[PDB]
Design a protein around this ligand. Structure first.
Ligand SMILES: [Mg+2]
Lengths: 148, 696
């Protein structure tokens, strides 16, 4: 649906060089996810290794702008809507009251697929629970998180 | 490998003769557990065969129930799994006659949860407390009757509370109407509460000396009014060692145990007091009255005249009949109020310690119902009337859930259903608790004012108000004797029981004279000052009890039920003995065959479209994240994507019906894996959002 703009490609080009490192006009695969998140994209780790596995077959663990730009255009075609994130949360909400305990949120995030580190979860709960009462409002948290 | 593990699979399923045969065949091979649908039927082995060890537990935990043989642990793991997937209060309802195995059944369930479920983190071990509560309650609440060597004289409903991780965080117990008279009286062959005998046989030298107690039970009139001080199936010295150890587990301090023992010894001493004469009644021996002041911590003089006098405005003396009656009233009050205290003290121990969150709004309870079962003796009085009425009210709830409700639902729905006929005991329940017109309501009417209505005047208004009723009979109807005078026959779901009306008014009004009440308020004993305080609105025992059961029912209706049906093999408490006449009678009034019919033709699961859709919608792309149409339509496309065969489900008016449990489990196991993906969506969204914040 969404197709790259002429302006958009310029944005992606400038931000891509920051990680250019050596200056080959190349980036490291292990550095791949970071540059996408910096561009507003929310790729999953499994999605990341699929991109790696395609362009890394030559080894060298590197990927250039053209093939990066390809990975960015594909990821932009299907991106979770705010409504899908809220509905995903809603599944871990048993009351249906739109609240989850920080304790329970921490438990699921760390114990369910693509697990966050304890340090990561700490940071998540910090801006997710604003009043620090141990309860997080996820519909409010999702807005802030998907906010443009 | 014997018979059929599930009656639904039984061929010739309409034969009552085939039913009992399967029970008999499995029983002698020592298979005591058998399924009717989700309902588990249990036959008392009356011997110890260990299916309850930790090896057995491991094979039932985390597995589907249709994939493993029938066992009590299955229902345990099924109920615990129900409590996990969907977060809803669950309750295991257990029915049976006296000695059917309800109490042992509840203890086994707990054991499974205690050794099976995961441990909390900062949570404590309430697991040991939940288990150790039984020995303590059995000592004080259980006594040997002719029906059961270990018999619960109190009803029990217990809640276990789980956190969101599935580990026990604590629990709560509710008790119902301890049998009071048992403390001052026993019919021949029966003992008093276990606690008394445990103390005498197991108590240490120094402790019994301090309580002024003799090791020989025959030396206490309250202990042996049944000529029975001993039971071959019971080692009182061992039970005592256990109870003493359990009290520490449930956090009784050594001082509280010495105080409780003081109260226990006082009742023993209390029964040994003899009254002689003046012209009117006074205490001959100083021995009991002595220890009595010390252990009860009251003034020896105020107690003596409290036993020998009555406040009317001066004090008139009493006679040997009245002086002995007041004594018993005190002993009953002291033990009963002490029992109530004991339960609260335990509840104080099981109660989780937390302030608020996280979360504690996410905790769900697992209820376990253990009550006193239907019992009938040669002589039946107020105590049996309460107990048998209790089983009626709960027998109604069983019917309401397993027969009435499920069938009325099909009708309201679009489901094709051929009605199955069942007996409804609702009529019997009304005979008792009906307003104004009811036995309990009448007994209350006669309880207004003293010196006016008697046991015999009560039965009279009973005959007059209840006229030619199917479940009520007296000597004034048809041919009886066998039906005597001063007694009424009531036909329960479990069969007819004859009651004497003598003692009914006195037992319904639970009356302790201000004289004796004041004396107890002056007690320096910590436990006693908690049970007795200060000094209008005197509600009757029967009406208060009626209130309790109503609350108990509405508590159970609000939970997702599991059913265990206990069956007694014989009247002799004998292993390997299968009595066909007895088992038949039970199968008949329990309505097990009428149940087998409903299960064979019925559906294991039903849910409203909206509820079914909100839950499983992530399993289909057309229903995810949202569905804009009618819920039925969403469930329609959703179940097609899920691959339900047309025979596996039925679309009703307001709900979807799924015939077999295997269908829903496979679905719940899919939602289990889908959660992995949904979590990844949140984690990916957070990982993206977080980087953009701490940078840029
Ligand atoms: Mg919630």
């Amino acid at each position: 649906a969404d197709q790259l703009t002429e302006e958009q490609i310029a944005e992606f080009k400038e931000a891509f060089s920051l990680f250019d490192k050596d200056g080959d006009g190349t980036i490291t695969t292990k550095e791949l996810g970071t540059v996408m998140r910096s561009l507003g994209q929310n790729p999953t780790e499994a999605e990341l290794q699929d991109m790696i596995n395609e362009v890394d077959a030559d080894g060298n663990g590197t990927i250039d702008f053209p093939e990066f730009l390809t990975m960015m255009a594909r990821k932009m075609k299907d991106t979770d809507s705010e409504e899908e994130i809220r509905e995903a949360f809603r599944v871990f909400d048993k009351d249906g009251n739109g609240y989850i305990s920080a304790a329970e949120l921490r438990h699921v995030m760390t114990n369910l697929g693509e697990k966050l580190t304890d340090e990561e979860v700490d940071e998540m709960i910090r801006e997710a629970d604003i009043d620090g009462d141990g309860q997080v409002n996820y519909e409010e948290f999702v807005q802030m998180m998907t906010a443009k | 490998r014997v018979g059929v593990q599930d009656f639904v699979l039984l061929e010739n399923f309409t034969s009552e003769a085939a039913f009992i045969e399967n029970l008999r065949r499995r029983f002698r091979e020592n298979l005591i557990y058998t399924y009717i649908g989700p309902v588990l039927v249990s036959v008392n082995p009356y011997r110890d065969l260990q299916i309850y060890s930790r090896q057995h537990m491991e094979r039932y935990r985390g597995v589907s129930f249709y994939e493993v043989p029938p066992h009590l642990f299955a229902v345990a793991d099924t109920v615990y799994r129900a409590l996990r997937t969907e977060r809803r209060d669950q309750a295991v309802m257990i029915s049976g006659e006296s000695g059917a195995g309800k109490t042992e059944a509840t203890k086994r369930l707990l054991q499974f949860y205690a050794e099976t479920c995961p441990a909390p983190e900062r949570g404590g071990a309430v697991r040991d407390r939940l288990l150790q509560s039984n020995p303590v309650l059995e000592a004080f609440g259980n006594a040997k009757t002719l029906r059961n060597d270990n018999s619960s004289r109190f009803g029990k409903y217990m809640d276990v509370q789980f956190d969101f991780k599935g580990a026990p965080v604590g629990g709560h117990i509710l008790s119902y109407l301890l049998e009071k008279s048992r403390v001052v009286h026993q019919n021949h062959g029966e003992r008093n509460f276990h606690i008394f005998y445990q103390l005498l046989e197991g108590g240490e030298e120094e402790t019994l000396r301090r309580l002024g107690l003799e090791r020989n039970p025959q030396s206490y009139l309250y202990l042996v009014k049944g000529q029975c001080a001993k039971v071959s199936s019971i080692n009182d010295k061992s039970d005592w060692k256990v109870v003493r150890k359990a009290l520490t587990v449930i956090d009784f301090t050594e001082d509280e145990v010495e105080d409780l023992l003081s109260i226990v010894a006082s009742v023993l001493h209390l029964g040994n007091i003899h009254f002689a004469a003046n012209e009117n009644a006074q205490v001959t021996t100083e021995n009991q009255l002595k220890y009595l002041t010390r252990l009860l911590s009251v003034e020896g003089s105020t107690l003596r005249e409290a036993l020998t006098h009555r406040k009317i405005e001066l004090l008139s003396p009493l006679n040997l009949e009245q002086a002995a009656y007041a004594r018993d009233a005190l002993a009953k009050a002291v033990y009963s109020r002490t029992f109530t205290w004991l339960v609260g003290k335990i509840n104080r121990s099981l109660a989780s310690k937390d302030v608020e969150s996280p979360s504690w709004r996410s905790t769900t309870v697992l209820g376990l119902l253990d009550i006193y079962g239907f019992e009938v003796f040669q002589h039946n009085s107020f105590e049996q009337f309460c107990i048998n009425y209790c089983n009626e009210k709960l027998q109604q709830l069983f019917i309401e859930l397993t027969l009435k409700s499920e069938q009325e639902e099909y009708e309201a729905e679009g489901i094709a259903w051929e009605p199955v006929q069942y007996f409804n005991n609702k009529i019997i329940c009304d005979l008792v608790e009906e307003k104004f017109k009811g036995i309990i309501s009448i007994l209350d009417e006669e309880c207004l004012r003293p010196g006016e209505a008697t046991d015999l005047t009560f039965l009279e208004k009973l005959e007059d108000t209840v006229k030619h009723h199917p479940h009520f009979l007296t000597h004034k109807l048809a041919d009886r004797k066998s039906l005597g005078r001063g007694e009424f026959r009531l036909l329960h779901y479990a069969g007819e029981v004859t009651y004497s009306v003598t003692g009914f008014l006195d037992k319904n009004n639970d009356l302790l004279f201000r004289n004796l009440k004041e004396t107890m308020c002056s007690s320096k004993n910590p436990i006693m000052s908690q049970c007795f305080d200060r000094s209008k609105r005197p509600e009757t025992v029967a009406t208060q009890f009626k209130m309790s059961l109503l609350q108990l029912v509405e508590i159970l209706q609000s939970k997702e039920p599991a059913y265990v049906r206990c069956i007694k093999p014989n009247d002799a408490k004998q292993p390997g003995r299968f009595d066909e006449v007895l088992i038949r009678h039970q199968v008949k009034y329990l309505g097990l065959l009428e149940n087998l019919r409903v299960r064979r033709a019925g559906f294991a699961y039903r849910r409203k479209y909206e509820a079914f859709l909100q839950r499983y919608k992530s399993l289909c792309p057309e229903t995810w994240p949202t569905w804009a149409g009618r819920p039925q339509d969403g469930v329609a496309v959703l179940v097609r994507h899920l691959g339900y065969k047309p025979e596996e489900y039925k679309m009703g008016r307001t709900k979807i019906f799924i015939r077999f449990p295997k269908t829903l489990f496979a679905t719940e196991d899919a939602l289990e894996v889908r959660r992995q993906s949904l979590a990844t969506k949140i984690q990916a969204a957070w990982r993206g959002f977080h980087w953009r914040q701490k940078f840029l």
